[PDB]
Amino acid sequence: AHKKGVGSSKNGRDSNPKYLGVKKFGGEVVKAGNILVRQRGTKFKAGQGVGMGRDHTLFALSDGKVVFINKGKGARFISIEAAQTE
Template identity: 60%
Template sequence: MAHKKGGGSSKNGRDSKSKRLGIKIGDGQAVRAGGIIIRQRGARWVENNNVGRGRDFTLFSLVDGKVKFESGKRISVYPVGAEPKPAAAAAAKPAPAPAKK
């Protein structure tokens, strides 16, 4: 039986606040201008089209639009109606010819 009341308690009882890092807006989701897309430490993800980077490496949208996660850990935001079309799908599918009667 311990004869001192708080013998081991002085080494316990510490914890840090969570930093709430990570992806806030997913691929294909709408974002407003100034909206935070990713909170991160260091440049794990990098900004691309219409995306800015804060001094704490936060990525945020510069325009209203949809978020696009691209190859090479790049993040873009495309305004509605200006999303990039896949090159392979556009080239493989020609426009249909009008039907003759």
């Protein structure tokens, strides 16, 4: 194509955010937080990041994978009250 001044005719662009696991919901190794398409492991989404926080959640099953370096993953040992078995 070809363009100049006093006019312009250019497109625009975005993508799908798509958070996914919706907080206190079962667990397993869903996904959630496509802030970074590459992503990484997480085990158990505690809700980290800079400053005090961490998502009030606690709900064991499996690994997790989440977001970027932006906020925070989890990996915590603890189901919620459970700790012995299952």
